[PDB]
Design a protein around this ligand. Structure first.
Ligand code: 4YI
Ligand code: OLA
Ligand code: OLA
Ligand code: OLA
Ligand code: OLA
Ligand code: OLA
Length: 414
């Protein structure tokens, strides 16, 4: 009984139970909120089905306390090794499926910009020089400012990952082009005249503004003071009429006509250019792998009470480390794709919170490796570790969304 330990001078069991109960309450509250407001754009724009999996893992993580702090029965040794190993696998397999799709969506997003500027600006598959005289390759990608051709080939090989001999491919020029876009977007957000327009435009019209920046530079695009303000006010037809009188349109009319048309329609018509049930199946597969790991250790090392509110079992290091390693790979893969997509603004900046969640999860799980093994109170540390990790996933990811649902119903709009 945790209450009796509290009376005897040990508040740790009663604390871990309160942590778990409050956590189940919150997880129940967040779940019902998402069910009720499932049709709203803050819940329907994401994977509602994967969130239920993520919430189940959080809930199940809080339930582990009731198998770590329980009465001595053999099934609770089975439920310990299930919950502690599977509850993270449930939350992070669905999360890695979610983040990986955002990375594929982000990569396919950058391909359109590349096909756009490939047609407008051009592309060389072997090393050349710009009008300054510095070595270049692809769509105007700078390699080195050194007069040595071998230096250009050296920095090119490091940039691609193979011995290119000064010759690349279309996909390897797309890779280098993605660096030049991020650079140009950084200058835009550092430019006070261009920043408010870029924030207002959709993804297609941001490509057209990046196109212009790639042609005239930041200071040059800043000259279109009136036309920029019309685009910010979403006055497309007027912005094209004004841009069609520019000196930019009369010097390069073929290119400018395509960029201007894209500003009007917000489509790619002027140029030549991941399922949902699959996410459930993939998330289900990644969870069965962890279940297989657990079941195999049930056979190699059957659960058994070692021998008291602390239920101590016979779980050996391999029974702890093997699911811990797989869970760590899920966390690392999550952190990788979440970091890669950390600036994706879709879904009310859903990706900004997911990235911050995985940063904390890494520090928590890495910190509790020396903490746990160097501890003589492993059951208590295991209780708080799971609950803490579960609270971070529930706090950083779902609380910002339940907030907008209940506190800001006016911002809940597509
Ligand atoms: C923070 O540590 C854990 C958290 C766990 N669930 N978190 C959850 C559960 C659900 C949702 C989100 N998050 C499970 C095992 C954990 N730890 C271990 O199994 C472990 C054992 C030995 C050494 C180190 C470690 Cl890190
Ligand atoms: C906003 C809602 C409040 C959220 C926190 C709620 C706090 C309630 C905490 C649990 C009660 C105190 C801890 C239980 C120990 C009781 C001791 C005993 O009964 O012998
Ligand atoms: C009652 C046992 C402990 C559970 C208490 C917490 C309740 C919430 C549990 C997990 C939520 C996961 C998803 C639940 C079903 C989603 C419904 C749906 O698919 O629309
Ligand atoms: C308001 C949030 C919840 C308030 C605290 C609820 C917890 C009450 C404390 C007593 C334990 C209740 C059941 C836990 C059983 C522990 C298993 C065991 O006794 O070995
Ligand atoms: C998305 C999956 C959600 C599952 C939540 C509940 C987890 C239950 C999973 C199966 C437990 C079966 C464990 C094996 C039982 C003993 C068999 C044996 O090893 O001899
Ligand atoms: C950033 C996420 C962290 C990834 C999971 C955390 C660590 C997973 C890696 C393997 C841990 C090494 C286990 C070594 C066990 C030591 C045996 C002992 O001390 O008794």
């Amino acid at each position: 009984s945790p209450v009796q330990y509290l009376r005897w001078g040990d508040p740790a069991p009663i604390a871990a139970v309160v942590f778990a109960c409050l956590g189940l309450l919150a997880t129940l509250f967040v779940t019902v909120v998402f069910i009720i407001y499932r049709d709203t754009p803050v819940v329907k724009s994401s994977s509602r089905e994967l969130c239920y999996i993520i919430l189940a893992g959080i809930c199940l993580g809080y339930l582990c306390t009731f198998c770590l702090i329980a009465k001595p029965k053999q099934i609770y040794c089975y439920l310990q090794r299930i919950g502690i190993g599977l509850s993270p696998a449930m939350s992070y397999s669905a999360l890695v499926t979610k983040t990986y799709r955002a990375a594929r969506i982000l990569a396919m997003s950058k391909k359109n910009i590349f096909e756009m500027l490939r047609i407008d600006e051009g592309l060389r598959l072997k090393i050349y020089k710009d009008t300054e005289g510095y070595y270049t390759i692809g769509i105007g990608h700078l390699l080195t400012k050194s007069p040595s051709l071998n230096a250009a080939k050296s920095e090119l090989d490091k940039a691609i990952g193979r011995n290119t001999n000064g010759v690349i491919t279309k996909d390897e020029a797309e890779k280098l082009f993605n660096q030049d876009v991020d650079a140009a977007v950084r200058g835009i957000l550092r430019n006070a005249k261009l920043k408010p327009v870029y924030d207002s435009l959709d993804a297609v019209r941001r490509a057209a503004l990046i196109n212009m920046v790639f042609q005239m530079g930041e200071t040059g695009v800043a000259g279109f003071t009136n036309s920029l303000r019309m685009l910010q006010q979403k006055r497309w037809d007027e912005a094209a009429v004004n841009l069609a009188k520019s000196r930019w349109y009369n010097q390069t009319p073929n290119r400018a006509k395509r960029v201007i048309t894209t500003f009007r329609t917000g489509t790619w018509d002027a140029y030549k250019i991941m399922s949902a049930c699959a996410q459930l199946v993939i998330a289900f597969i990644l969870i069965c792998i962890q279940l297989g790991i657990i079941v195999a250790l049930f056979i190699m090392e059957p659960p058994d009470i070692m021998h008291e509110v602390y239920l101590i079992c016979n779980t050996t290091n391999l029974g702890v480390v093997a699911p811990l390693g797989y869970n760590g790979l899920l966390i690392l893969a999550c952190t990788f794709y979440a970091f890669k997509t950390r600036n994706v603004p879709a879904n009310f900046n859903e990706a900004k919170y997911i990235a911050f969640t995985m940063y904390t999860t890494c520090i928590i799980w890495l910190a509790f490796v020396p903490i746990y093994f160097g501890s003589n109170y492993k059951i208590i540390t295991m209780c708080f570790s799971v609950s803490l990790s579960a609270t971070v996933a529930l706090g950083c990811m779902f609380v910002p969304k339940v907030y907008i649902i209940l506190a800001k119903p006016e911002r809940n709009v597509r």
